[PDB]
Amino acid sequence: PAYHSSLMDPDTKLIGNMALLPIRSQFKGPAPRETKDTDIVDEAIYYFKANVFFKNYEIKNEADRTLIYITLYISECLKKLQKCNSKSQGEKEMYTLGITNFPIPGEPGFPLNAIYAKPANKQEDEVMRAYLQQLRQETGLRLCEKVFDPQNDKPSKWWTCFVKRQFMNKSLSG
Amino acid sequence: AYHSFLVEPISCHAWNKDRTQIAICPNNHEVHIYEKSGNKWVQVHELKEHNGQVTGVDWAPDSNRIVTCGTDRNAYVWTLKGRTWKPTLVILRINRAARCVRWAPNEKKFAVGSGSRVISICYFEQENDWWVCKHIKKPIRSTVLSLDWHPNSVLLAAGSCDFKCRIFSAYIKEVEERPAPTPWGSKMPFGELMFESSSSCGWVHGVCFSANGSRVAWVSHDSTVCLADADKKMAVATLASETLPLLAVTFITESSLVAAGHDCFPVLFTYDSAAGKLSFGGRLDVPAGLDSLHKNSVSQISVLSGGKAKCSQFCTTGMDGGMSIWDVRSLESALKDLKIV
Amino acid sequence: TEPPMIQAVLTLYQGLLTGVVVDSGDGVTHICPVYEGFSLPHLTRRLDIAGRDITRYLIKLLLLRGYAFNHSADFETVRMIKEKLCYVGYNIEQEQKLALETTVLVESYTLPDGRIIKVGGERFEAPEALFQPHLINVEGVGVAELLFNTIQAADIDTRSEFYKHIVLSGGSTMYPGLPSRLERELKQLYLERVLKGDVEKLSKFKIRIEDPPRRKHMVFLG
Amino acid sequence: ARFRKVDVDEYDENKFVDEMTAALQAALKNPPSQAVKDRAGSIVLKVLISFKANDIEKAVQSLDKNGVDLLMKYIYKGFESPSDNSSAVLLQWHEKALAAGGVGSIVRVLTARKTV
């Protein structure tokens, strides 16, 4: 079936009903310190090509919600990297997209509100916002090393080809 | 005035006392009772109990009881209790299908004609609180197709497939008593054969007694109509039609008969006691792909109001699934050259 | 509640005290004579052929007709078909001419998966097992012949009444026409094996095989 | 199972048991062994065939309904013995006998238990 996250510890913290997982990142955010060598962002970029094709996804733990969120974000990144003409350009174009304020759980525009709990108060609200942007930035960075082939100006068609495919038929821009 | 209840044959029908409800059998083991609301027909009751098609229905007016008989050999008497009809089984003691049924005018008895070549005269014994029946067998040789009672509730006319129209006595001293004499005879013990037509052809599809019961008429499959006059030594008047067999007949006066059948339209017949002759009075239905109201054979015709003495409206139901209501006066206008008695 | 080997008496109790009750269910058929209130244990025989045997035999026939029914997976479906379309032929020779020369017997039956099948001659052929066991590889004489013997075996003075008091019992005897076939069968036997062939006394032999019109819950009513 | 080969129904006591224009009027008189019947139908068949296609409607219309019915029972009989134009002419006799007797005259051909 679809691929689930395996980074859900009994002592894992919850931001809303998503999982507040670690992330190797030079970007600011409420993300805990990296425990091992593979963070949630690694699982998303990894399982992506096989997950994006699915329409249904059985949510098991809050780690799945973080996974699903990043997955959907990769789709956003590719729709940008697609029109790029250099890794540098992409690196820059991603920062801007990560800084963009996409809708979050509870907001009209955020698909899947019936699955993602809404922040219960202004504090959890600011944390969640920060986290999501943090993930967006890190993900958009790594994904950039991938999409671009050692021969710059070449956004690999092996990533660009998925631009029109939406995980669970859902979208952060739709 | 035509109305389609369905596109399948209305096997038979019966109207209550005030002609407010009509019981029909839509080619099923069932009987649907319809009632009008404004100018629309609405089904108010569905009587389910027979295990075969219902071939006959009769509604006793005053006691308001519906009697039905089917091909399942059974007969049920339905009694309205509150808002539902409850059936009571009546064993006719036959091993073939019941073909027709009529309550006697006095509602103390009901007769059922069947494929066992007999007629079952049924009545109730309060003593043992159930229904019983005696058989009228001789000289019936084939299936009894139609029955009609004489006003004295004793004489019974029958038409069967042995090409005969006969009048019997269904005298049951256990529910009524000594019948007064009649031109049909003075001896009316149970089963006595009072009259038997002398035809050798044509199944007798329908039989009818006139208002005063001194005349009995019947229609046969050889496309003829007949009338035996008891006041003229039981002489029989005959009239051969140029068209198809009539399946149902009734008197609308003491000298006028209306009938319908395979031609699909009602026709008028008049009797002249003087000459002792019958005459064709013409088509009463003047304008699939037919010029007639009914689209298939008409198989039952009944008097809706005015009695058989001076009928003012009659009803017809046929194999087309339609039921028509004919206004005698209206008909006498659309046709100025009509003659009724 | 006493199945033979007494419901037969219960049934008869209809208003009769002496008669023969041919009861047939799913698994077994019995012929239970009953005299003046009690059931004579002897004279009561069993017929190894009932409702399951017909329901099964139908499956075989429907196979030859081009319909593939699994005996296990579809036994219930065919039983419902049997109950609804099957009947006992009166004169097999004449029933077969109808099936072979006309189509008046063909009837449609919608299966649970929406498919519509057509059944014809097998509607009277399946129940024919009861009369000709050899059709379902069962050795015997068939419910009819059995009845005749079972009566022609009992006392002489009691046969007259018996013959005019045979009464069907059990669901497997609800087949349309069954009573008539039996009455025609006994008359053929009586003619051959009792009147020796004097087709001039056959009219004095009175048979009366009744199919109880009041019958859904007789055992009790009894 | 030989017993089952005799039609016991034959002895059942319930089985039913039955109990030129001048030339035409001439032949239609006193109608009835298939010998006497055939002899009868032949005399009438003889007269019908001996008619002109324009002298039929005049002879048919000169008969009372009972006569027409009889003519129709004979016309149908004619149909069972084709030979020459006898059938092309009979079909003309049918046309006229029908317009006069109506389909009902045919009904009485089918209904007759004792016919020609």
Added chain:
Amino acid sequence: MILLEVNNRIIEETLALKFENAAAGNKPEAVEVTFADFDGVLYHISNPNGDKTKVMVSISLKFYKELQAHGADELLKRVYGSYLVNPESGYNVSLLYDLENLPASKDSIVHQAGMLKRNCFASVFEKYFQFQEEGKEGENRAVIHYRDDETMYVESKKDRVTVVFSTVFKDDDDVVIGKVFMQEFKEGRRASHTAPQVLFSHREPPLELTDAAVGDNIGYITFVLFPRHTNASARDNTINLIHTFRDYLHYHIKCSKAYIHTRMRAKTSDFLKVLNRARP
């Protein structure tokens, strides 16, 4: 398709595929095929002794000795030459193609292989066409039993060669449909006067024929061929047509019956629309 093809597609296509793979340098696959042809013919294509580099094509005609008495062997040698090898047990003629020694153009050999059957037939015709072309008359007639219950009779004369087929109709109705067809051949010259004259005798054999059978289902067709057909220019074509006739005739009797069927399906379909339009 009106005329029956003369070549055999299974033979041609099998050889073709094998030769193709041979040319491509591919490794040889094993081949084992059994098939038939009209008139009780049976073929076998195989690798003699399991040697996948050798493909053998064999034909079996129950009536080969007959064709052999009329030059078959000689003709077959002329056509196939060194491809002709001793006949496989159960067959009369065998062609062997060495996958490792094929010609530049495989076209002719494949085409010729496909015509094995027709070539086994050709000799009896060339023989008698020659008799006429040399005016050598009085020569005995050739009797070929091409089917278990059918016979062909070749016979030369001063200015013509006649071919008589004794054919059988297993279907009684096929005789009637066959007669309609024969009738049109009988009159075939009306639109082609230079064409062969066909004759037809329904139950009895033409006088010219002996132990010839007689029956309601038998039929005798005669073809009168003239020099213009039997000379060294028309010859092959004449043979290609004349030897497929009997099958040509039955093939058309059968296709007619199929055509009748499409008619009956349409007429019945119409009838059912009416009946149902009679439903309220």
Added chain:
Amino acid sequence: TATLRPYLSAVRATLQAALCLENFSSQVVERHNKPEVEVRSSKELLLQPVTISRNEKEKVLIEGSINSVRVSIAVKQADEIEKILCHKFMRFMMMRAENFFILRRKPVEGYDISFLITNFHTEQMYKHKLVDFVIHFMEEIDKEISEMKLSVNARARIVAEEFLKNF
């Protein structure tokens, strides 16, 4: 084609008279309902059989009864080719008898095709329309047997000439 119109007319009128049916439960078998013209186990329920012949070859036999009618037709077959085409065509239809609810699987002995019209048909369908169908049928089979005959000869000539021209 002079005697045709008169023939059908007589046939149609006889069909009018005969198709006057009603539902009739068996007098012989408890709870059975069969077409009397087929079983004939009750003589009083059978009408007198009648025939309408156009000539010595063409004719229609009409057998009526209280609840069903059997109509048999003797189809025109001039020569052998019409004979086999006719026999073939009638067989094609009899094999499909179940779609032709009124068709008989086998003809009455002596005829080419037969119909069995029951009260159930005269109820499910307008009887006058059924009477038109039989007449329509008679007309249309003839036209069909003719077209088929021409189709056979038509293809015959083309086939004979396609072979002869090539020599």
Added chain:
Amino acid sequence: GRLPACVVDCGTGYTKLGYAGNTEPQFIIPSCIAIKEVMKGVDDLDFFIGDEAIEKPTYATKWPIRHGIVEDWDLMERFMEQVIFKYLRAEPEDHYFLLTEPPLNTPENREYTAEIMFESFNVPGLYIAVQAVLALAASWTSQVGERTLTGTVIDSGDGVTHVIPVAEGYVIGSCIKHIPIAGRDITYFIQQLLRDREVGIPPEQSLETAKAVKERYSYVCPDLVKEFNKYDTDGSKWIKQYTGINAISKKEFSIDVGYERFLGPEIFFHPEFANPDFTQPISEVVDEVIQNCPIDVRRPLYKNIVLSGGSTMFRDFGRRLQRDLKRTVDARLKLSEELSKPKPIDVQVITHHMQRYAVWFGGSMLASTPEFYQVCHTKKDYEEIGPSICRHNPVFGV
């Protein structure tokens, strides 16, 4: 007899024809007929079938068979004419014929087929075999020592896949189930994947390309991520090239072939990838079908899952079905043991060589046996008892 029987297997898209006894069909052609489009003269004869009828400039291509069942009889009949008289070159009056029928073919259709074969072609004998049984028979060639006609056939052509339970040679009709995924669906899918990534592929040849790729490169993998990984990691080892020629240009066009290779066949197991209305993995439908069959025959069905169809050709397809089904079934018995020890169920998926023409192969083997001649309807019986005899066709071969 000396002449071998004729064996014809008519599929919706392809017909397999040849003589009994042979290992493979002598011809495998497109189940189509091209005609000119009142029929007069010899017009009915002007047609072509199979390949020769696909691009005929002045003829209309027709497909007399829909969902494995004959729809157009007039056209199916002519098709047969050439099958017999042009390709097989068989005298129809001399060969017995074995034809096949999809499950759920009516007895009426059998009589129509019989009418054509006996009354148009005069065949001496006919047998209509049910495709699923022939498939079960073709598998006795494989992993199997004891042959049986009880098993689960998984037929997949270009239309709709079928999961058919067979017990003792008779299809259990009431338990058949169909899957909205087959060859055509896979092609349409592979096509998109290509349209999204590659360029140069002539639109007029979008399909041809897809189908070519599906048949020459596709296969079933054991795990998506790992396969996706492999291609992205060692692309060199898994990315294949595919060249072609344009129609109106003839200019050779090249494209790379990737994910579609294993993604294409994957929709059998994860239908939701391409079908928005169907989601059951094939392994679940099979499991469900068998559960609906009589209990006393369920284990036999699980031990004998046999394949048939060009769509079951994908490499390891059967191995992936077994694994998946072994789980779906083991998982179930894992709960029944908690809510309380049923013997483990043996799930086996047989795979053999003649899988594209499995049915034809089985018909060829059965048609070349003596018993075949014993259970065929002869021309005499057809004419003495009627076409009704062709309704039933005795199973045989055990």
